[PDB]
Design a binder for these strands. Structure first.
Length: 465
RNA sequence: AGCGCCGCAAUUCAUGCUGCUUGCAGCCUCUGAAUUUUGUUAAAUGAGGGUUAGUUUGACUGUAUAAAUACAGUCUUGCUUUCUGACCCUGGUAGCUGCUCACCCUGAUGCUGCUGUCAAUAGACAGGAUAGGUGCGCUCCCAGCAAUAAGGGCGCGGAUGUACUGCUGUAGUGGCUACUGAAUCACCCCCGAUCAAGGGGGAACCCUCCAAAAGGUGGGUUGAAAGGAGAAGUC
DNA sequence: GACTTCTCAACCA
DNA sequence: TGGTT
């Protein structure tokens, strides 16, 4: 729900063949037909015009009796997986447009487990943390993960054991694992697409559930949402012999949420409202950080892009060179060519993650519960209004010199992934416990002044509300 | 010459250091910032393609420390990525299949550019990435080609011709499929596995100890970092 | 390749 | 293993 981990799954050949023949021959045709029938179904204009869609129209388009001769021999959870995927696809598509869709790949569609369980674990004679699936209990796999993520799988197994020992008095809403994805991965070679295709499982986990105090905050979130749900729908709709069972089940979840788990106890990170960390993005320096406390109007510390990256500062120049080279070949090959997928490296993402981690670390060191960021939409102007301000520094009043230098500079220095940087800073701040706020970056001034004024303006906007 | 980056150096500061008054004073030592000029100063940046389930970036528990952190003991697994090294190769057999070409001017976000011997533009062989230029790189500059960016001139040989064509070969430059040539590594080597599986032998350095000097003992090390993944679209 | 949406069940049979 | 909200 907040973090995703992954691990390869290694198992019998018969198990792999059976799972593939169940996926690519019985499941993916099912998802494709569900998408096609949803597209062909009437009221599509009403759905798209109104936005969103009714909750159970895919399940009600199962009314053509999914159990057709072509779809026989499938566990129910896999039917639910097909329903999940199709509903998510159409939900996202109908939200995007404010038309028939297909699969944007050649590999079989993944398997989605919106439920916590259906991933019953084990530990074979050799000690490996194996896993099988609901309906596919005969399919015993073996988890191959990294030591950087092993403790999550062991937490999964031990949470399942904890609930089992108490005869199901620990709520499955506090389980660390939320969803699982059985995604087939591409494999270079030739042969059957289950000996030359690797299966990888993705576990969705909430990092707050690792500790105990975060488990309490998720507890209180669950309690508030459940109480609002029951007090909003119980009071009306006159219920029936079906949604009264839902009321009873939500009440049992509410009571089961309090019989908590023995959990690591790392105290919650509490910041200060006074201290805001403002990260001002720019074109010459892609990010500059200031740690300003607004009560005393002083600034604790400025950090340039070199200081944040430390021993990874060479990655910035590597990425700038790679961006220049990629843009050069993309323009050069735009003459109706088709070269390779050049620059497949995720170096930009790597530097983004390094910057986000360093910024969050600097936020923690000064105990700041608010990191201030600029809006993405505004940014398309700032990089346009900064380069010209650079030209006026070198050729003041020489307009032709301004344009020439601006063109050469834009050739040498491009925009640097200002969206993924904000996204990863948000991810790391949410993981640590730091609130991300939006500010108004001044279009004029040095990067340090821009960062300080960004954070100060964010605080001044906050004080009103 | 231009631009970007690296470092260097005198220059001014704090984001840094001291001092008590806890925001004021001075210094530049560490850490950094700022259009301040330089590149024999040692100086940091930078190499064409490919090679490891490769090592470290871990979790739990207990500690001093307000945390941040450092030590201790248990466990450990290999997923997806970014560097840093070292290594291997600058290919072969075939099939197919793109774009372009009468000739002449301008030359593009065009192509090519290493070393030493043979040799005629063209290439063979042995090496091989400190592969044209500045410290390094460029959509910049140099040289050659330029039909394979646009543009312009004028030929023949065909057209009922009014329309459009051929001047195209043992052509140039690319793409794909299948087979096999080398590396399948993280201090080095041999053996074996690649849906699991490690086992063994060695080299330098440091430490505990026996010590009687010498010699011997066991232990540890021989690069690190990051992650939220699926699915569908927008430019 | 850089942005834009959506999901991130929990008890009971 | 399988099921309604």
């Amino acid at each position: 729900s907040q973090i995703t981990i992954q691990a390869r799954l290694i198992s019998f050949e018969s198990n792999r063949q059976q799972l593939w023949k169940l996926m690519a021959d019985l499941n993916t045709p099912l998802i494709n037909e569900l998408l096609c029938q949803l597209g062909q179904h009437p009221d599509f204009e009403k759905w798209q015009q109104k936005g969103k869609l009714p909750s159970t129209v895919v399940s009600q388009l199962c009314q053509p009796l999914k159990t057709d001769p072509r779809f026989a021999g499938q566990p129910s959870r896999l039917y639910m997986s097909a329903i999940h995927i199709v509903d998510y696809i159409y939900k996202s598509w109908l939200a995007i447009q404010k038309i028939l869709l297909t699969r944007s790949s050649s590999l079989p569609f993944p398997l989605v487990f919106e439920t916590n369980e259906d991933m019953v674990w084990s530990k074979n004679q050799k000690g490996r943390l194996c896993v099988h699936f609901n309906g596919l209990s005969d399919l015993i796999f073996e988890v191959y993960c990294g030591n950087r993520q092993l403790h999550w799988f062991q937490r999964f197994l031990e949470d399942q054991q904890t609930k089992r020992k108490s005869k199901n008095q620990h709520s499955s809403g506090l389980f660390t694992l939320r969803n699982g994805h059985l995604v087939w991965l591409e494999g270079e070679g030739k042969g059957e697409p289950w000996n030359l295709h690797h299966l990888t499982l993705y576990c969705c986990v909430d990092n707050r559930l690792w500790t105990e105090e975060g488990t309490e905050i998720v507890r209180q979130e669950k309690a508030d949402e459940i109480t609002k749900f029951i007090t909003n729908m119980k009071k009306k709709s006159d219920l029936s012999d079906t949604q009264q069972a839902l009321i009873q089940r939500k009440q049992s979840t509410l009571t089961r949420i309090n019989n908590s788990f023995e959990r690591p106890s790392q105290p919650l990170y509490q910041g200060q409202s006074h201290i805001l960390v403002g990260v001002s993005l720019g074109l010459e320096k892609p990010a500059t950080v200031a740690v300003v406390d607004a009560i005393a109007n002083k600034v604790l510390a400025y950090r340039s892009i070199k200081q944040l990256l430390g021993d990874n500062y060479e990655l910035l120049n590597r990425q700038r060179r790679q961006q220049q080279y990629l843009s050069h070949e993309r323009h050069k090959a735009q003459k109706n060519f088709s070269p390779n997928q050049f620059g497949a490296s995720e170096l930009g993402q790597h530097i983004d993650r390094l910057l986000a981690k360093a910024i969050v670390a600097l936020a923690r060191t000064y105990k700041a519960g608010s990191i201030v960021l600029p809006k993405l939409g505004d940014m398309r102007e700032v990089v346009q209004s900064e380069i010209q301000a650079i030209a006026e520094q070198k050729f003041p009043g020489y307009i032709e010199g301004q344009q020439k230098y601006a063109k050469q500079y834009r050739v040498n220095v491009h925009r640097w992934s200002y969206g993924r940087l904000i996204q990863s800073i948000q991810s790391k701040a949410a993981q640590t416990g730091i609130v991300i706020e939006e500010g108004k970056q001044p279009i004029r001034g040095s990067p340090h002044d821009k960062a300080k004024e960004l954070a100060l303006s964010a605080y001044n906007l906050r004080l009103t509300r």
